[PDB]
Amino acid sequence: PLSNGRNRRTRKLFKRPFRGHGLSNTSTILHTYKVGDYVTILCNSSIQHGLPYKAFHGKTGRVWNVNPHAIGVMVNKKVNNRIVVKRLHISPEHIKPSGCQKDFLERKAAVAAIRKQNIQLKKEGKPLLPLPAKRLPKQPRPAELIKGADIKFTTVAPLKFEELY
Amino acid sequence: SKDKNRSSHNQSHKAHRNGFYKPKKSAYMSTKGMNVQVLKNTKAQRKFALAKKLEAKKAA
Amino acid sequence: CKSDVMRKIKIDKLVLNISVGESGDRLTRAAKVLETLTGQTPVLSEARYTVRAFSIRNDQIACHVTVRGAKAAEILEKGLKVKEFELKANNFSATGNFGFGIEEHIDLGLKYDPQVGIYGMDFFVVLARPGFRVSRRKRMQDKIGRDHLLTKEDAINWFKETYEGIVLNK
Amino acid sequence: GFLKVIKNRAYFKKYQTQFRRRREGKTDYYARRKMIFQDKDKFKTPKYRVVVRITNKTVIAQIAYSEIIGDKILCAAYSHELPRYGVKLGLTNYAAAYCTGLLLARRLLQKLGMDKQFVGVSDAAKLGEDYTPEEVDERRPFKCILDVGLARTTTGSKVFAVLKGMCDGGVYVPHSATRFAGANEEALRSRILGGHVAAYMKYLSGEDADLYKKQFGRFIAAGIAPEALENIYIEAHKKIRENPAAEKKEHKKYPTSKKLTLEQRKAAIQAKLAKLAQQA
RNA sequence: AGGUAGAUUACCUGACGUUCCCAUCUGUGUGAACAUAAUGGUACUGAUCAGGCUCUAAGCAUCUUUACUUCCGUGUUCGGAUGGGAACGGGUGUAUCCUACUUGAUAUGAACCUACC
RNA sequence: GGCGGCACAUCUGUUACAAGAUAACGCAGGUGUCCAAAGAUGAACUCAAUGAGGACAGAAACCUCAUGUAGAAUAUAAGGG
RNA sequence: CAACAUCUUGUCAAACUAUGAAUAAACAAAGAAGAAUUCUCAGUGUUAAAUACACUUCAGGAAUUUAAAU
């Protein structure tokens, strides 16, 4: 039976990383957040002022407003049988840029490089390039032939039991 | 007459009969509490654009 | 052009400390003699932890002062004069410093009144080299190299070369 | 015998080193992160700092704005280039610190082209009174922040001599004139023009010839009288507000040790092992 | 090659020794004024007679440490599943996920802006 | 049921099951305060402990050097910083 | 012989921990309304000044391409 404190059950959650105490990097306060970005809430116990509630720890949210010192973040919270929208205002020390769209932005960039080539190619009248193939779950690999010149065989059989004492 | 205190039994089955009601799109587009200067710039342009739109209507 | 000039040992600090167990009367006079001896106001040191055996926390107990430069060298000679340049080999620390004690302050014995009284003193001398500032400066404060730092025998040789003092094994 | 050495491996496995520059004793990260923090709603708009560092022989002044990749220097000015403007000796005076601050202000405004409307003060009679650049038409002056570093800010420190030169050059650096050489004007003015240097010069002349020749040896060889300093810094100021725009080979390298490859390193142990085999 | 400002915050730390300094930096001389303290030691300011002795920087070592790789080991544990075996205790088989400590080999920094060489 | 206790308002660690929630008259403890400074800010400094030295002075008084990742201190319970 | 250091050994922690799974939690995989590009482009403000940047139905307006993105 725990208590109803604001920071209950935080012996391990709010502990600093091993050999990671003291000041934070200057990239945390220098990184520029724009409205619409994706950020991850990461409570920093070393800064007691403005510490976000521990339930929002590790939640990926979107930036909805940028203030002189605080970055508004919009995350989803689960209630009895519904989902509500929580709007916060955290200092940059307690957040971190999110890489949730890291690979998506490579596929957005690759299709734009092809499209920029296609418009030019149509200007010269030459046939245009095809769009990149979509990602697929690991497909059944096709048949193949193995050259036996550089192939060695090792027999596999159950092993005689050997005592570990 | 001691009674059972609490149980989470059957609670998840109840919460999913009518599943988690996601918020609508308009929930994410609220603007209350935005930056003060940003709201001032946006209001200034919306007033300027409306007046230009209205004088054409009055012109025709 | 040899760099031995930057390895010359010099006395950079001499500390005279008078430790009396009572506040007032004795401490006022003890500070007075140290001021007359050197020429600067000493400080009044307060106890760190109370000890009922010695009848002493916040009470001011002792007085001490440090002199540097030509004044430090002169007063050391007077302190060694009464000691007759007789220093045991154990008086020297492993860090290259040393010290000794004085039972009667010579000063002025003509008008030696019971008001002034007789106070004993202890001399402690801190040696150094040109280049020791690298550990005391405010910006980029570092550690002096091990070879640059003094040793017990290095201090002893300095004593036996600038004052012709002997060192005993008794 | 007894060691109880607290340097064992159990001590190092838990050790946490400081930031490299703080570990070197060159940067106060608790105050640096305050001079760096641009407002979050001013996206990527630089926050400029005047980085004033005085070595034993040079007054380094820089204008820097911070980025994640590093600190970028918009402009710089040193006191070793003062000989171009007529000041040949005493490059770390309160007087030379003013020239370095003035030179960097005029060098910067020349770069941005905004030096024709922002001129500051020029006459020598107003060197001692407070001046802060103001709005010209409706264009604000170039605002900068004074970064002092690990230097105590006393009431006569030279880091504010540079700031006074910057403000006199027309570049706005917020301040208060309670730490200048004055804090009236002529007391401040004299130190700006080397009055404190050209009174030790005369004082020592009367007292001792040995001390005078020991402290101002290169001044005597240069022929600088204890009266020329006042006019020298006036001319240097005049020659700075007319051409601050910097200036324009091969550098001779000197390699130091170079590393040992795995082959050389392994052969050293094998040879030493062979020596240990025959020696023992 | 060196200095100023940094970003990564030990591949950057620590111990033992070692190499230049031509510029630069440092240590270095002084106390008159701004300023400073019990002390010109610090901080402040004025300077250039000397020096690579320390700092700094570069490298050395079957170096502690730290950082990647393999191995440890598909061994610990685990999600799913019997009218499977056992009096219990606990532990199979099936479709699966798969650590850690240790040990061995390697590395001991990369990189951004400005000035000078 | 009574007697006993407060699990009745309330905090920390643990049971507790690496999101959130979370039982027992489960375990180990805590609150009904204290503070014109123990609030705000600027500056300077570095702590516990250990070794080696110094008249009385010794195991414990005061002074100096070296090592010292916090092993000190932070009003209070415990856990965080 | 203590004791103190230093090197091994045997066995442990719900209120010890460097390391740390499996199962899980919360994102993204194209809705100011299915993309993109080009040209033109205004109101405020940040800014030293901006043609940069921020917000304004990715202010707005016009052309071409386009239904693609486990």
Side-chain angles (χ1 to χ4, degrees), chain D residues 34-52:
Chain D
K34 294 206 207 209
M35 279 166 323
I36 263 191
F37 186 82
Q38 180 65 276
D39 289 51
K40 289 277 110 163
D41 65 327
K42 305 180 186 167
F43 316 78
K44 256 132 184 174
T45 291
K47 225 206 180 145
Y48 300 96
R49 319 171 279 119
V50 202
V51 180
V52 183

Side-chain angles (χ1 to χ4, degrees), chain C residues 137 139-143, chain D residues 15-30 150:
Chain C
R137 68 196 177 198
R139 181 173 187 272
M140 338 168 279
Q141 159 177 335
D142 324 300
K143 304 164 97 192
Chain D
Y15 197 51
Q16 193 204 318
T17 49
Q18 261 167 323
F19 283 0
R20 173 181 86 90
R21 276 198 90 80
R22 160 64 197 142
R23 208 201 310 123
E24 270 161 35
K26 311 178 101 134
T27 293
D28 185 4
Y29 274 106
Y30 296 92
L150 288 183

Side-chain angles (χ1 to χ4, degrees), chain A residues 18-165:
Chain A
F18 189 61
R19 292 173 20 210
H21 296 260
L23 285 176
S24 54
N25 326 331
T26 43
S27 319
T28 82
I29 49 167
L30 276 179
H31 185 252
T32 295
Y33 301 106
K34 317 222 174 182
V35 164
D37 252 338
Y38 283 98
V39 290
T40 287
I41 301 171
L42 281 174
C43 315
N44 191 358
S45 34
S46 150
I47 328 287
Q48 287 86 28
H49 187 257
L51 198 60
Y53 184 46
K54 48 169 281 266
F56 300 134
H57 186 94
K59 303 278 163 278
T60 323
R62 275 192 107 179
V63 182
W64 68 277
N65 172 75
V66 181
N67 255 320
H69 304 302
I71 304 290
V73 182
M74 207 186 41
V75 309
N76 266 349
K77 197 203 181 193
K78 211 153 272 195
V79 197
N80 189 0
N81 67 323
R82 58 176 206 274
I83 287 157
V84 300
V85 188
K86 289 315 183 178
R87 278 183 229 282
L88 302 127
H89 261 113
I90 319 146
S91 91
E93 288 94 27
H94 305 292
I95 57 190
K96 178 185 84 189
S98 187
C100 69
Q101 290 208 121
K102 169 173 132 181
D103 76 333
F104 178 44
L105 292 191
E106 337 280 353
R107 296 186 271 110
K108 262 181 155 165
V111 83
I114 272 181
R115 270 209 186 106
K116 193 163 267 267
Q117 282 314 356
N118 276 355
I119 168 178
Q120 185 181 357
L121 283 184
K122 198 186 65 104
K123 207 42 83 153
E124 295 125 299
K126 297 178 262 283
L128 30 67
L129 292 208
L131 295 190
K134 60 174 170 180
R135 302 125 65 239
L136 292 149
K138 196 67 111 191
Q139 298 289 281
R141 49 100 202 172
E144 46 196 280
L145 186 126
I146 298 179
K147 310 294 192 38
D150 39 11
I151 273 299
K152 96 189 209 80
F153 290 97
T154 70
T155 310
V156 163
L159 285 177
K160 158 185 197 173
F161 172 63
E162 281 315 323
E163 189 59 89
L164 74 168
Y165 300 123

Side-chain angles (χ1 to χ4, degrees), chain D residues 197 199-216:
Chain D
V197 197
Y200 201 48
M201 279 222 63
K202 297 223 272 301
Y203 161 86
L204 280 198
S205 271
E207 308 328 278
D208 199 316
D210 162 44
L211 301 191
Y212 176 53
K213 282 160 201 40
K214 193 195 187 191
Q215 165 103 341
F216 297 107

